[PDB]
Each structure stands twice: as structure tokens, then as C-alpha cells.
Amino acid sequence: NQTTSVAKIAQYKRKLMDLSHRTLQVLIKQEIQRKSGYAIQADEEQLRVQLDTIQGELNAPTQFKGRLNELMSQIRMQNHFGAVRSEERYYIDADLLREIKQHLKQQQEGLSHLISIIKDDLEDIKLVEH
């Protein structure tokens, strides 16, 4: 049922994407239709100057899209040589691994108390703001 909820979420977020694009294409046309026959406005030249700047950032060959293409090319070439890097399976003792598990346990139950207290205090402070 947990896996069925993941499948529902993975559909229902993608159905919200359809509806969001449809709201956007309706509002775009309604605003063009509302301002049709008027000169360009100060709200609207500001909006275009922000959108021109954003479209510049998205096309600049050294920004996002260019970087994302080399991240892929590096990860594949790195993996091609990782699949040749020869496991040197060193040993670590069973009771050295026992005390490393106990260290990581006391550190984790300690982190659990800090993640209690930040939620405990952040709900308590909302009882002063009302």
C-alpha cells in the first residue's frame, strides 16, 4: 500500500503539472486579451526585462545547460574507469566494527534528541506568537 501511495504521488504531481501549464496558458491569453489595444505598461516592461534576463541565464553556454551536459560526460567517463578500479578489500576487525557501530549509535540517538528539541521548542514558541 506504501508503494501504491508512491505510485499515486508519481501520477498526481504529474497531473498537477498538466493543470498548472493550462492555468498559465489561460492567464497568458487573458492578460494579452485584457491589455489588447493599450500601449506597453511599466508593470509589463519590468516583467519583460526580468524574463529577458532569465532567458539569457538559461541560454548562456557557461551556465546551467552547459554545466549539466559536462556533469553527464564526467560521470560516464568516471564510471568507465571506476568499473576498472580493482577492489583492494582491506580487513577491519569485528569488535572494531562493534565499537564503531556503538559510537555511531550514541551519536545518532544524540542527534535524535537535538531533532526532538528543535521541534519541541519551535512548536512551544508558536504558543507565544498568538
Binding site: 541560454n59 553556454p61 557557461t62 545547460k65 552547459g66 554545466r67 551536459n69 559536462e70 560526460s73
Partner: peptide, 11 residues
Amino acid sequence: MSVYACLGNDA
């Protein structure tokens, strides 16, 4: 620096 990143969209 990589020659591939230095071509980007042109590469």
C-alpha cells in the same frame, strides 16, 4: 579546464 565545457551548446 575541459575543452568540452568550452564548446557547450556548440560541442
